[PDB]
Design an enzyme around this catalytic site. Structure first.
Site, PDB file in Angstrom:
ATOM      1  N   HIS B  41      39.559  45.598  46.894  1.00  0.00           N
ATOM      2  CA  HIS B  41      38.276  44.938  46.672  1.00  0.00           C
ATOM      3  C   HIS B  41      38.023  43.761  47.622  1.00  0.00           C
ATOM      4  O   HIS B  41      36.933  43.181  47.626  1.00  0.00           O
ATOM      5  CB  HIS B  41      38.054  44.540  45.212  1.00  0.00           C
ATOM      6  CG  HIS B  41      38.856  43.404  44.688  1.00  0.00           C
ATOM      7  ND1 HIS B  41      38.759  42.107  45.160  1.00  0.00           N
ATOM      8  CD2 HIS B  41      39.757  43.369  43.697  1.00  0.00           C
ATOM      9  CE1 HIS B  41      39.591  41.330  44.476  1.00  0.00           C
ATOM     10  NE2 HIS B  41      40.204  42.082  43.578  1.00  0.00           N
ATOM     11  N   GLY B 143      40.904  33.235  43.723  1.00  0.00           N
ATOM     12  CA  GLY B 143      41.697  33.190  44.943  1.00  0.00           C
ATOM     13  C   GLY B 143      43.109  33.721  44.739  1.00  0.00           C
ATOM     14  O   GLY B 143      43.887  33.792  45.701  1.00  0.00           O
ATOM     15  N   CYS B 145      43.941  36.764  43.540  1.00  0.00           N
ATOM     16  CA  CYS B 145      44.086  38.206  43.711  1.00  0.00           C
ATOM     17  C   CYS B 145      45.090  38.517  44.818  1.00  0.00           C
ATOM     18  O   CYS B 145      45.121  37.815  45.843  1.00  0.00           O
ATOM     19  CB  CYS B 145      42.758  38.889  43.988  1.00  0.00           C
ATOM     20  SG  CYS B 145      41.611  38.741  42.597  1.00  0.00           S
TER      21      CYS B 145
HETATM   22  C1  LIG Z   1      38.389  33.619  37.377  1.00  0.00           C
HETATM   23  C2  LIG Z   1      37.696  34.044  38.504  1.00  0.00           C
HETATM   24  C3  LIG Z   1      38.276  34.907  39.392  1.00  0.00           C
HETATM   25  C4  LIG Z   1      39.598  35.392  39.188  1.00  0.00           C
HETATM   26  C5  LIG Z   1      40.263  36.285  40.061  1.00  0.00           C
HETATM   27  C6  LIG Z   1      39.624  36.803  41.291  1.00  0.00           C
HETATM   28  N1  LIG Z   1      38.556  37.617  41.147  1.00  0.00           N
HETATM   29  C7  LIG Z   1      37.962  38.097  42.258  1.00  0.00           C
HETATM   30  N2  LIG Z   1      36.859  38.936  42.058  1.00  0.00           N
HETATM   31  C8  LIG Z   1      36.190  39.417  40.852  1.00  0.00           C
HETATM   32  C9  LIG Z   1      35.216  40.184  41.757  1.00  0.00           C
HETATM   33  C10 LIG Z   1      35.967  39.641  42.979  1.00  0.00           C
HETATM   34  C11 LIG Z   1      38.454  37.753  43.562  1.00  0.00           C
HETATM   35  C12 LIG Z   1      38.067  38.082  44.906  1.00  0.00           C
HETATM   36  C13 LIG Z   1      38.863  37.497  45.826  1.00  0.00           C
HETATM   37  S1  LIG Z   1      40.116  36.522  45.147  1.00  0.00           S
HETATM   38  C14 LIG Z   1      39.572  36.898  43.546  1.00  0.00           C
HETATM   39  N3  LIG Z   1      40.168  36.417  42.461  1.00  0.00           N
HETATM   40  C15 LIG Z   1      41.552  36.676  39.740  1.00  0.00           C
HETATM   41  N4  LIG Z   1      42.219  36.264  38.651  1.00  0.00           N
HETATM   42  C16 LIG Z   1      41.607  35.435  37.838  1.00  0.00           C
HETATM   43  C17 LIG Z   1      40.297  34.950  38.032  1.00  0.00           C
HETATM   44  C18 LIG Z   1      39.661  34.057  37.138  1.00  0.00           C
END
Ligand SMILES: c1ccc2c(-c3nc(N4CCC4)c4ccsc4n3)cncc2c1
Ligand code: NA
EC number: 3.4.19.12
Lengths: 305, 306
Positions: B41, B143, B145
């Site tokens: 993604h 961030g 992921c």
């Molecule tokens: C709040 C908010 C985000 C969280 C994430 C997250 N989501 C993501 N996306 C959802 C659609 C793209 C992304 C995209 C790049 S890095 C990342 N990281 C991962 N883990 C927890 C989280 C909590």
């Protein structure tokens, strides 16, 4: 989202762990530049451990009595001296993996990561607080002595703990890296016991802030309190006093959640008086006191190393 | 003695973490030999999020669209492919810090360590279990992921999880390192919800054995139970059923403590009935379900405090 007991990444410390053997005794050492740090009690036998004369035991030893192993490699000890309760073994090779580091002494209430090791081999990492009674609630088996505690402040490792012993109650005692004990403990076999411990109030409040940030809000109430009234209550429950400094340190969290510190104190008052009435906070049925204000801000922001 | 949630030392994984940027999206990747693994993604835009066509998005990319940074160094991407929900970027340098490793797919109840990372930079390490509902109760911000879960048995890193997303309930979903999701989840922003979660019964039993090994006996009782009656009661508290496999797995701990598995099951029944009445077990006022039988044997003495 989410809230976990989180340690610092341990890689920078892993690259400093070695095995130290003297006689039949084998334990862990910390290799920084051209010195290996370990507990001085590595020189003792069981009968020495009753009433050791460290100076006298040490003078009797030669460099070659100390076998230092970094993975598969033997290092050559070329000198040996003592500083308080830590032994310093001068070695012929500087550690090429030596991180930026300092030796720091922490205060009760502060947290750190422990890299637990056996035969110079890192086995686990966990996060601890220095208890008000100067013990740590660790997880340590035979062979764990010389395992170390640390924080990472940027790229710089602050070393704050070295493990020396377990107390009869199954909690743990050790030194800073200058060999000074935390707490009224000695490196011998006599009767020794941890004092009665207290709860770290400022940390509990920090964790309540963490709960609020994670959306867990049922314990908030409309009430505020004063430092003095709160402290009258805290004392009764074997909670450490809350100081103005503690209030200041929570300032950021207070601002971010819109719950003033004495507002949150009124919540904590009620929790101590009434219990949790079958509810949990961040998945816990007891009040957690091993997260500092700094830890909470760190984990609820995403600072990295 | 002592009993702590303990993570694996993270250094072998720290040396594999890189930052991966595509367009305005930056996340973490795992650099092993000459391949960087990351969530596919990363190639999505704002438009793509509900119904991304990954094949179509991917075909439109060239190697040089992917910026991979390993600390200070840029790596050159020389190839790219998709496997399920993971992107594999071939790079021109093998990672000299590659550990011995394998990719393993784990089952609900299994534990692992997570190295949470941001911008390819390790932030913290914690211990997790795969929940029965195929989520993990992690600690992850935007961030994060491409952060990974792992075990280290001996010198070998077994990678078992890569983080993809957070579900509305604040729990986390991801894949194995072959890009197959754990659970019914997809890397799209359509509505999805985790199943109702249950307690990992076999892990709770393991932890009760750990308590006995560490010298705690207050919750034992004179009773035994049949497996079926145990399950009938356990289900009512939202506990996973215990299978004969689970019983077999507890064999070693049973042998070490002298308490049969169904004897310990009867203790758990009573605990569920009564609560703890102001007591703790290994410092907890709830029953802990994130230690496996293997973890207990690993962490504990091999002699019990009678
Ligand atoms: C709040 C908010 C985000 C969280 C994430 C997250 N989501 C993501 N996306 C959802 C659609 C793209 C992304 C995209 C790049 S890095 C990342 N990281 C991962 N883990 C927890 C989280 C909590
Ligand atoms: Na209040």
């Amino acid at each position: 989202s989410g809230f976990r007991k989180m340690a610092f990444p341990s890689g920078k410390v892993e690259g400093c762990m070695v095995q130290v053997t003297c006689g039949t005794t084998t334990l862990n050492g910390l290799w920084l530049d051209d010195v290996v740090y370990c507990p001085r009690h590595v020189i003792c036998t069981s009968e020495d451990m009753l009433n050791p004369n460290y100076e006298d035991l040490l003078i009797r030893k030669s460099n070659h009595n100390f076998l230092v192993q970094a993975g598969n490699v033997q290092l050559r000890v070329i000198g040996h001296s003592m500083q308080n309760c830590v032994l310093k073994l001068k070695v012929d090779t500087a550690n090429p993996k030596t991180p930026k580091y300092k030796f720091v002494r922490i205060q009760p209430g502060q947290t750190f990561s422990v890299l637990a090791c056996y035969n110079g081999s890192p086995s686990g990492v966990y996060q601890c607080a220095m208890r008000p009674n100067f013990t740590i609630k660790g997880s340590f088996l035979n062979g764990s002595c010389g395992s170390v505690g640390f924080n990472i402040d940027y790229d710089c490792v602050s070393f704050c703990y070295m493990h020396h012993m377990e107390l009869p109650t199954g909690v743990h005692a050790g030194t800073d890296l200058e060999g000074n004990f935390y707490g009224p403990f000695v490196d011998r076999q006599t009767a020794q016991a941890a004092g009665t411990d207290t709860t770290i109030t400022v940390n509990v409040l920090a964790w309540l802030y963490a709960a609020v940030i994670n959306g867990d809000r049922w314990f908030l109430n409309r009430f505020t309190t004063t430092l003095n009234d709160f402290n009258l209550v805290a004392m009764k429950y074997n909670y450490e006093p809350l100081t103005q400094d503690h209030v200041d340190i929570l300032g950021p969290l207070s601002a971010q959640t819109g719950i003033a510190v004495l507002d949150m104190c009124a919540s904590l008052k009620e929790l101590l008086q009434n219990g949790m009435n079958g509810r949990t906070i961040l998945g816990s049925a007891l009040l957690e006191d091993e997260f500092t204000p700094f830890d909470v801000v760190r984990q609820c922001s995403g600072v990295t190393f």
